[PDB]
Amino acid sequence: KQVSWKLVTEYAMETKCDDVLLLLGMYLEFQYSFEMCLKCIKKEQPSHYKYHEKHYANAAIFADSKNQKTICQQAVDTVLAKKRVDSLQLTREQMLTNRFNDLLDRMDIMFGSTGSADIEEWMAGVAWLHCLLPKMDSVVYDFLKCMVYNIPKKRYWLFKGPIDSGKTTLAAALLELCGGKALNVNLPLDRLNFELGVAIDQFLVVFEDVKGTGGESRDLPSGQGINNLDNLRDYLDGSVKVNLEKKHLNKRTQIFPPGIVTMNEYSVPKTLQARFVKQIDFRPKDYLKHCLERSEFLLEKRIIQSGIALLLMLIWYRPVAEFAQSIQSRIVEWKERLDKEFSLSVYQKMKFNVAMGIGVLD
Amino acid sequence: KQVSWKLVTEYAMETKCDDVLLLLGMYLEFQYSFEMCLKCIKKEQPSHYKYHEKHYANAAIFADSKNQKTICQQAVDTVLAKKRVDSLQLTREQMLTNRFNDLLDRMDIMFGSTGSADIEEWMAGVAWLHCLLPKMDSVVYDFLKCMVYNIPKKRYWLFKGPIDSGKTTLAAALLELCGGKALNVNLPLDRLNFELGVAIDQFLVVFEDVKGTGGESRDLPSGQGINNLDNLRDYLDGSVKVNLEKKHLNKRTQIFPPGIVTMNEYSVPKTLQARFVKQIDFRPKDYLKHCLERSEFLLEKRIIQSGIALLLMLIWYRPVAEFAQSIQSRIVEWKERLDKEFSLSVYQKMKFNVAMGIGVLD
Amino acid sequence: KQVSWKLVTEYAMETKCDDVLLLLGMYLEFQYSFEMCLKCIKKEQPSHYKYHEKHYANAAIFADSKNQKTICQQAVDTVLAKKRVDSLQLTREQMLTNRFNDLLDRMDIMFGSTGSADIEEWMAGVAWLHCLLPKMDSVVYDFLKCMVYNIPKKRYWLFKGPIDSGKTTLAAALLELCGGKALNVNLPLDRLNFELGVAIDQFLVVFEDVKGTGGESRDLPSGQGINNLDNLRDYLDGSVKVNLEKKHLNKRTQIFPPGIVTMNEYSVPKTLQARFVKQIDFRPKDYLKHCLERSEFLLEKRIIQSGIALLLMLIWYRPVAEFAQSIQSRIVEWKERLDKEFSLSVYQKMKFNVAMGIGVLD
Amino acid sequence: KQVSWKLVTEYAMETKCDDVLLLLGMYLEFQYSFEMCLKCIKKEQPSHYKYHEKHYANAAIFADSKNQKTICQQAVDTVLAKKRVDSLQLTREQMLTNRFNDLLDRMDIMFGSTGSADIEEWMAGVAWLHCLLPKMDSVVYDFLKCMVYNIPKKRYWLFKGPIDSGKTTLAAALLELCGGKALNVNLPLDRLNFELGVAIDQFLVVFEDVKGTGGESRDLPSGQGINNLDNLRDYLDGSVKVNLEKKHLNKRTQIFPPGIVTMNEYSVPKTLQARFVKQIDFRPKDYLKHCLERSEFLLEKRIIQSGIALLLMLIWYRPVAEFAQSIQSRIVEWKERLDKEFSLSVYQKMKFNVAMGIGVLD
Amino acid sequence: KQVSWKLVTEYAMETKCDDVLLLLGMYLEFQYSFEMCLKCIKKEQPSHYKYHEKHYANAAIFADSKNQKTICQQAVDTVLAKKRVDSLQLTREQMLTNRFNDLLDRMDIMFGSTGSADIEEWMAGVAWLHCLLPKMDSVVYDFLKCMVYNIPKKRYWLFKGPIDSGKTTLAAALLELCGGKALNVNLPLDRLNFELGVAIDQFLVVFEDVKGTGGESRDLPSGQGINNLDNLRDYLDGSVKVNLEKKHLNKRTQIFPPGIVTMNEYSVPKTLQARFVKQIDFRPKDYLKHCLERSEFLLEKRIIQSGIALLLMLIWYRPVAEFAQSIQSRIVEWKERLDKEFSLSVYQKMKFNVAMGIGVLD
DNA sequence: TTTTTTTT
Ligand SMILES: Nc1ncnc2c1ncn2[C@@H]1O[C@H](COP(=O)(O)OP(=O)(O)OP(=O)(O)O)[C@@H](O)[C@H]1O
Ligand SMILES: Nc1ncnc2c1ncn2[C@@H]1O[C@H](COP(=O)(O)OP(=O)(O)OP(=O)(O)O)[C@@H](O)[C@H]1O
Ligand SMILES: Nc1ncnc2c1ncn2[C@@H]1O[C@H](COP(=O)(O)OP(=O)(O)OP(=O)(O)O)[C@@H](O)[C@H]1O
Ligand SMILES: Nc1ncnc2c1ncn2[C@@H]1O[C@H](COP(=O)(O)OP(=O)(O)OP(=O)(O)O)[C@@H](O)[C@H]1O
Ligand SMILES: Nc1ncnc2c1ncn2[C@@H]1O[C@H](COP(=O)(O)OP(=O)(O)OP(=O)(O)O)[C@@H](O)[C@H]1O
């Protein structure tokens, strides 16, 4: 009798494993009897204990195969092919739908029976989120939908604001919920051609603060950014496809993704200003600085800039109807838990602790 | 009959051998009758003499095969696969506990009946090391915990200061203890691709005497070191995953390992300086040299570079409860052996001899 | 009937051959009847005529095979594996002891019945080198010890002197004796990657006339030498492992071997001066030149730059007890043969002639 | 029935062919019925017409093979393997002897009945060459001895003179005589890596028209050559092996060949001047020009470039004793043939014509 | 039943195809029923309709093969092998004779019954070209012989004159007639290396439009080319071999091919002037311009660009004895066609019209 | 796939 290549391929699909070594390693673990399997008994890892008993007979024969890496290479191809199909076929909303469902799986397990971070800390995370600026959940929801629609011109917001104003901290966090990258335009125009290639295939993008050419009138350093960006008419508009470039590599073309421009409190051409839907001046805030100094568990469990923290803020504020239609069930199922475990008073109290800069958990 | 690839792969696992040439050479030694094997008789290498009798029959049949490198390739991939599975599943504490078991097994041999090392010399090494900086064991205990907790923007400590001030000496001992990697960045910005590629699946990394720009007024030549350092601060923050390269293999994404950086008293952008929890500056002391000059077996046997010396130091200084739980059995067993073999007065004799700059053994 | 891959592998072990083309070429020669083999009758190459009769029967079947390069590849891998195993398990003293046995075997051939070398001419070379510096044989013993002990950051010797000072000549003989490699560093800082990759598993290295800067004041055209080397301080220090690269191969990690650097009298950053444990200064001396002019067979046979000549010097000058215990047997036979073949008065007649700058022989 | 790979290997060996495509295309020609082969019947190519009839039957079966390029690859390997065996085992004298045997075979064809060459035209070339420098044939003999002996730091000859003075003409003939390669060092310092790679296994090399810097007073266009070349001083000296590189290939290690440097009349750094064992001035002369204008069949047939011309000069001038012992038999036969063809008066008449600047013939 | 690899190789040989994909695609088309094949019925492409009926049976089995690309590779190799045999063995006269046969085959189609060309319009082309220079037909015949004999120094021709005076038109037709490549030497000196790499194995080269320096007074834009050419003396004189490079390939060594240089009226150094056999002056002539206006089917169909036009000019003007002896039989048949198709009065009326600057046809 | 080319 012989290895079923089919069963190996199922496991790769189910785990969504797409590293051949990782697939090989884990599947070999099943070769011992599941009947006594201590990893199963300890319930350490679902990717093991959910599967061992089913795969056991096949894994034994797999361990005797002389061909093992070849089996795994085909299985990894299957998962990569699946991704490339979906990546071409599906809508931006379907794509965001799936990423929500993915992060809602981390929501599921992180506070599952292992509880390996206390959900309450993430409530305090939500508190130090929603303090930041007016209606912060709605400002998120608005900018999120703006980026899903990817409507031409209506695509770029201007995060003005000085040093440590938090703009980078927030925009970086949002890319967990979506994926993307940040960019540089202060490096001179000969380099810029290659800098632009970093935007390729990004679901979202962001820009570094312009060291704007005029900013040293404000004593804000003047790299090439302002005149560079003011000249890049289409890229912001996303009206048509454009070419993009990388070292040692050929050109490619697509519509240039939507995004964010951050800056310090720079001077700007009215033409470049006309490229933006919004401008906001972020600022450091005197409660918030001391509150973080007093609330550092939010940094320790890596809460603050997690998409999971944005996801909770979103789940807490936003109506079920505002979410991806089928996932709305899962949204109810978490509105259940979050409002079950946490009163509005502790939530309000936590926000009031920020409202006085005292440490959030109290 | 035919080769058991299974028996080959077991040896590769139990040696934890992960080089295909090394494995091939090793296994071919077993083709002779262990009945006369001089290496067995000499008890020359455990990786041989423990296994020769068991594998002899299979090695004879292996010696005739025409597939020999292919057999070894599959066996090596099994070992790499095991590492990759541990890499993602284990806690950083669990990793460290494994690492310590490996070192303890080696010490069991080194000071065993084979006994090629004598612990008095290594204890003199401990004395020299604990003399090198105040409360050395305690500063080590801090670094270990910091490295296990892996707190972002706090993942790195920097050593500054003149040559021959021991920063390398200490880095070497810690790196052996942790099983990290050294890395270089004083290099073409592009070629960092595979260099950082080595950071795949490592607990810890070290960057050596990396070059500032300016300070050549003090005979410190400018170089790409500090450029590449103050660039890549995300790798020092560690809040961010990076995709890492190897030849003829996929790129793989992970959080970059935490680490140590070292320099002489170069220039350093404050933007980079922000990343380091401790930034300690190392400077020479001469009585150490006079001791070394009189104690040169310390350097000749590289004792003061070994992580083994640090582990001996931690056994001597730290409470049993400060160790990870499972090994505390072995900790106690070694504390017995140390405190049995050495009075404190012997350790005093050593340590004042060190401080006095006289030969430690006396 | 079929090819024995085993017999091929033995021949590669026997010859220590490790180029697949050289292996293939030489094994093919055995296809003709050794009974008639003109090369055997000439007794021209030992690696042929020792083996032809044994391998003839298998070579006839190899000559028909369709796999030939594959059979040779496996054999070369077996030899390379043996090197890897030895490199990881021998003491440096055993490695050197093996190297000396190989040279002694060549000497047995050279001065054997085939006797192509004249031991008088070779001993004249010993007199010339023993004259080149004070206490020459003592200096060689010091260097050997230093390379065997391999004390970290006490690992490199610097040779300085004007052109035709003889520093290259001395370095060449030492390099043959220990079997290192020479390397160039007066080079662009990128391709150093594959250049230094040659040092993998080598016992010793030499860097040549390494170009400094500001040298035109002394008519030394400046270059990248000193610039590059004061980067690689760790490679000199040998305090930690480093990663070495080859084409189509992933990096190998190991300590970088000890060695020698040669220098016309450029400037030196003391960051670099710190790492040479010793420097020797060389001077042109015209009477040696007159001797060479009258004694051209020294150069034509390259005698004065062969490690064979250094070995003969050591046999003449050093106690038998200084040699590693096993070869002391062979050493005694060569001491006897030398004392038989030369009176001291003949050697004194030579050293006198060398001092006079007359042709060595009279 | 099946293809004899052995017969293909024989054909490759006998034709000394080492291009897989040329070997393939050649062997395929034999598949047509030998008895009609117009290439045979017109006696156009010895590499065809000697072999077609022998190889015919196997060529027909080879034409049907599904495996054709694999068969050719194996055959080409054995030809390459033989070259490497020879490179490591022949004396430099034997190499030159073999090279001479090959040219002498070509001369048997050129002046055969099938031979198109006019021996009188080729002998006219020798007259022109013997005029180009004093004691021309003695100079050739001295150069040959120098190349055979390959004495370190006494290995390189420098040619200089005005443009149109004869220098590359003479270099070309020596290079065809000995075999070797020309190289251009007036380059950026990076691609020197692959440029110098060409020297692998070569006997001679020639550096072509190395450019100095300054001396544009003498209308000399400046370039990298001299300053660049002075960095490679050890490649000239040849005291020690060096490492050489080809595209997509690992570094080879060997001693860098001896050879010739050509330039117009720049000045030379005496670090490099010291390395030239001999220097030859070339000067324009009117009678050579006027003779050559009236003797253009010399140029039209490339006579004065070609190694056959230098070989003919040596056969005329040098004693039989000076040739390596085995070729003395063929040398004697060629001497008889030449003396039978040309009286001394005819040769002296030619020389007098050249001196008079009339066309060589009369 | 089996695929015949032989029948594929015959098709590849007969089509002279040497792209695997082009070979593959065309063979697959034959799998459909030849008897109704629409492409056959249209007589659309000779590479198809001549062959479909023959290969149909094998194409059907080929369509089921699992080895398809492997079969094609071996076939394409056979075509490439034929080219290298030819390149190394044919005389330059035979090369040209082959090239003419290819053009004559295309003309048989073009002016066939299926032939879409009009022999009258193509003869109008010849009338215009014969007016472009005095003695045009003799000038071509001289150029061809100069290329065939390839006599050193006597190798290169210079085309000179104002912009829009036809020089590149004539170069292009000659380049099509002989086969060859254009090259641009106006580059900086570094990239010239890969540029000249294009010349490998070519028959002719054209140096397009080399820019001088100065003559900006005459509005001529300056550039490197003239200086670069003056630095390539040996490539032009073609007396000795040179090394040539391609991307990702090792160098090859050959005589650099003969060719043409073209320029506007820059000043030419005498060093460069001496390199050229012949200079041809091109001048604008209004009557050609007004003729082209009223005869633009010449331009539209690219008639005056084509080597096919020049071949017709040779056939009309040259005696049959001037052609290579084998093709003289075809030449007579084409002369016979042309004599039947045009009286001299018809042709001379066209020449008169061109001299009037009137449209060619009346 | 890298290496080489590109990049610089
Ligand atoms: N309101 C705030 N007041 C003070 N500190 C803050 C505030 N918000 C965030 N921070 C802290 O400051 C860090 C830096 O913030 P961030 O980089 O996002 O600011 P920035 O405005 O984009 O800065 P810069 O203009 O200097 O690039 C944050 O990661 C957080 O630790
Ligand atoms: N504080 C010290 N006092 C005296 N000797 C020291 C001291 N620290 C190190 N050494 C000696 O200096 C030599 C090198 O030590 P080490 O490489 O660790 O220093 P370093 O400061 O890291 O040097 P570098 O800057 O060259 O890397 C060793 O011989 C070591 O014993
Ligand atoms: N001390 C000496 N006195 C005189 N002649 C010497 C001396 N040493 C070497 N020679 C001569 O100089 C030649 C070259 O010697 P060597 O290459 O070893 O010198 P070097 O100083 O290392 O030179 P370089 O800097 O050119 O590499 C020797 O072959 C010998 O002919
Ligand atoms: N000594 C000479 N006197 C006169 N004419 C010469 C002389 N030597 C060569 N010639 C002519 O000069 C032509 C070019 O010679 P050669 O190819 O050796 O050129 P070069 O300028 O001397 O060398 P290079 O190009 O290497 O600098 C010869 O083909 C011949 O026509
Ligand atoms: N002798 C001529 N007299 C007038 N017009 C001409 C002549 N030769 C060419 N033409 C016109 O010039 C146009 C371009 O010709 P062509 O491209 O050969 O010119 P060129 O001067 O050789 O160009 P370039 O130097 O830019 O490559 C032709 O299409 C035709 O219209």
User: Is-contact C333 C267, C-beta < 8 A?
Assistant: no
Q: Calculate how close chain A gets to B298, using CA atoms only, in Å.
A: 41
D360: burial class by Cβ within 10 Å (0-12, 13-18, 19+)? buried
| D188 annotated ligand-binding residue | no
- Take residue D323 and report the two structure tokens written for it: 């040739």
- Take residue C247 and report the two structure tokens written for it: 């084409």
Experimental method: cryo-EM
Would you say the C-beta of A6 is within 7 Å of strand F? no
Backbone angle region of E164, left / alpha / beta, with phi > 0 → left and psi within -120 to 50 → alpha: left
Q: Calculate how close chain C gets to B151, using CA atoms only, in Å.
A: 27
Distance separating alpha carbons of residues E188 and C287, to the nearest angstrom:
53
- Give the best residue of C15, C16, C18, C22 to mutate against chain D (max D CB count within 10 A): C22
Distance separating alpha carbons of residues B40 and B42, to the nearest angstrom:
5
Contacts of C245 in chain B (CB under 8 A): 194
List B259's β-bridge partners, or say none: B156, B205
For E44-154, list the strands marked E by DSSP: none
Ligand nearest to the CA of B289: 2
Q: How far is the CA of A163 from the centre of ligand 1 (A)?
A: 7
Would you say the C-beta of A1 is within 7 Å of strand F? no
SS3 C174: helix
Cβ distance of B68 and C77 shorter than 8 Å: yes
Nucleotides of F under 7 A from a protein CB: 1-8
Q: Which candidate from C24, C221, C300 shows the least CB-CB separation from D81?
A: C24
Contacts of D300 in chain E (CB under 8 A): 149, 151-152
Contacts of E151 in chain D (CB under 8 A): 299-300
CB of A99 sitting under 6 A from ligand 1: no
Q: Phi first, then psi: what are they for B153, rounded to 5°? A: 55, 10
User: Is-contact C78 B23, C-beta < 8 A?
Assistant: no
Ligand nearest to the CA of D239: 3
Q: Which of E196, E275, E283, E191 is nearest to E239 (CA)?
A: E275
* Full strand arrangement of the beta sheet holding E276-281: E180-183, E204-207, E259-263, E156-160, E276-281
- Take residue C75 and report the two structure tokens written for it: 């054999």
Q: Calculate how close chain D gets to E234, using CA atoms only, in Å.
A: 10
Comparing every residue's Cα with the C1' atom of nucleotide F1, the nearest one is: B248
Q: Phi first, then psi: what are they for C208, rounded to 5°? A: -115, 130
Distance separating alpha carbons of residues A69 and B77, to the nearest angstrom:
8
Q: Which of A28, A6, C247 is nearest to A20 (CA)?
A: A28
Distance separating alpha carbons of residues B172 and B206, to the nearest angstrom:
9
Cβ distance of E249 and D246 shorter than 8 Å: no
List B158's β-bridge partners, or say none: B261
Give me the total of CB pairs closer than 8 Å, taking one residue from chain A and one from chain B.
Answer: 40
SS3 E229: helix
Helix, strand counts (H, E) of chain D: 19, 7
Give the ligand 3 atom nearest the CA of D234.
27
User: Is-contact E31 E24, C-beta < 8 A?
Assistant: no
Q: Which candidate from C195, C223, C300 shows the least CB-CB separation from D149?
A: C300
Q: Phi first, then psi: what are they for A279, rounded to 5°? A: -125, 140
- Take residue D76 and report the two structure tokens written for it: 């080409």
Would you say the C-beta of D249 is within 7 Å of strand F? yes
Cβ distance of D85 and C45 shorter than 8 Å: no
Cβ distance of C168 and D250 shorter than 8 Å: no
| C165 annotated ligand-binding residue | yes
| E306 annotated ligand-binding residue | no
Q: How far is the CA of B114 from the centre of ligand 5 (A)?
A: 93
Q: Calculate how close chain B gets to C341, using CA atoms only, in Å.
A: 39
Q: How many CB atoms lie within 10 A of CB B296?
A: 13
User: Cβ < 6 Å from ligand 5: which residues?
Assistant: E 132, 163-169, 209, 284-285, 288-289, 292
Chains touching D (at least 3 CB pairs under 8 A) are: C, E
Distance separating alpha carbons of residues C79 and C73, to the nearest angstrom:
10
Distance separating alpha carbons of residues E275 and E256, to the nearest angstrom:
14
User: Is-contact C32 C52, C-beta < 8 A?
Assistant: no
Interface of D with C (CB under 8 A): 5-6, 74, 77-78, 80-82, 84-85, 88-89, 149, 151-152, 154, 189-190, 193, 227, 230-231, 233-234, 237, 239-243, 245, 248-251, 253, 269-271, 274
User: Is-contact D165 D284, C-beta < 8 A?
Assistant: yes
User: Is-contact D147 D258, C-beta < 8 A?
Assistant: yes
Distance separating alpha carbons of residues E181 and E200, to the nearest angstrom:
10
Q: Which of D343, D338, D341, D318 is nearest to D328 (CA)?
A: D318
* Full strand arrangement of the beta sheet holding C156-160: C181-183, C205-207, C259-263, C156-160, C276-281
Q: Return the amino acid letter for D75.
A: A
* Amino acid D292 CA to nucleotide F7 C1' distance, rounded Å: 49
List C207's β-bridge partners, or say none: C183, C261
Cβ distance of C221 and D237 shorter than 8 Å: no
Q: How many CB atoms lie within 10 A of CB B240?
A: 13
Give how far Cα D226 sits from Cα of C208, D183, D187, E341, Å.
19, 14, 11, 67
Place of tokens 């050509």: D262
Give the ligand 2 atom nearest the CA of B304.
31
Q: Tell how far CA D98 is from the center of its chain.
A: 13
* Amino acid B102 CA to nucleotide F3 C1' distance, rounded Å: 39
Q: How many CB atoms lie within 10 A of CB B201?
A: 17
Residue nearest to atom 28 of ligand 2 (CA): B164
Resolution of the experimental structure, in angstroms: 3.0
CB of A52 sitting under 6 A from ligand 1: no
- Take residue A216 and report the two structure tokens written for it: 């040293």
SS3 B133: coil
- Take residue D89 and report the two structure tokens written for it: 């085992």
Q: Which of D286, D285, D283, D287 is nearest to D359 (CA)?
A: D287
- Take residue C304 and report the two structure tokens written for it: 């004065």
User: Is-contact D266 D253, C-beta < 8 A?
Assistant: no
Contacts of C17 (CB under 8 A, 6+ apart): C11, C23, C26, C76, C79
Q: Calculate how close chain C gets to D103, using CA atoms only, in Å.
A: 25
CB of D164 sitting under 6 A from ligand 4: yes
Distance separating alpha carbons of residues A133 and A279, to the nearest angstrom:
13
User: Is-contact A3 A65, C-beta < 8 A?
Assistant: yes
Contacts of D249 (CB under 8 A, 6+ apart): C247
- Give the best residue of B80, B83, B84 to mutate against chain A (max A CB count within 10 A): B84
Give CA torsion, residues D97, D102, D108, D114, to 10 deg. 180
Give how far Cα C210 sits from Cα of B235, C178, D236, Å.
36, 21, 16
Distance separating alpha carbons of residues E121 and E125, to the nearest angstrom:
6
Task: Locate all alpha helices (DSSP H) within D116-252, ordered by sequence.
Answer: 119-132, 136-149, 167-178, 192-196, 225-231, 233-237
Distance separating alpha carbons of residues A355 and A238, to the nearest angstrom:
40
Q: Which candidate from D239, D249, D251 shows the least CB-CB separation from C172?
A: D239
Comparing every residue's Cα with the C1' atom of nucleotide F4, the nearest one is: E248
| B1 annotated ligand-binding residue | no
Distance separating alpha carbons of residues B81 and E34, to the nearest angstrom:
56
Widest Cα–Cα separation across chain C: 74
- Take residue C208 and report the two structure tokens written for it: 């040549």
Give me the total of CB pairs closer than 8 Å, taking one residue from chain C and one from chain D.
Answer: 96
Contacts of A1 (CB under 8 A, 6+ apart): A61
Helix axes C52-62, C5-15, angle to 10 degrees: 140
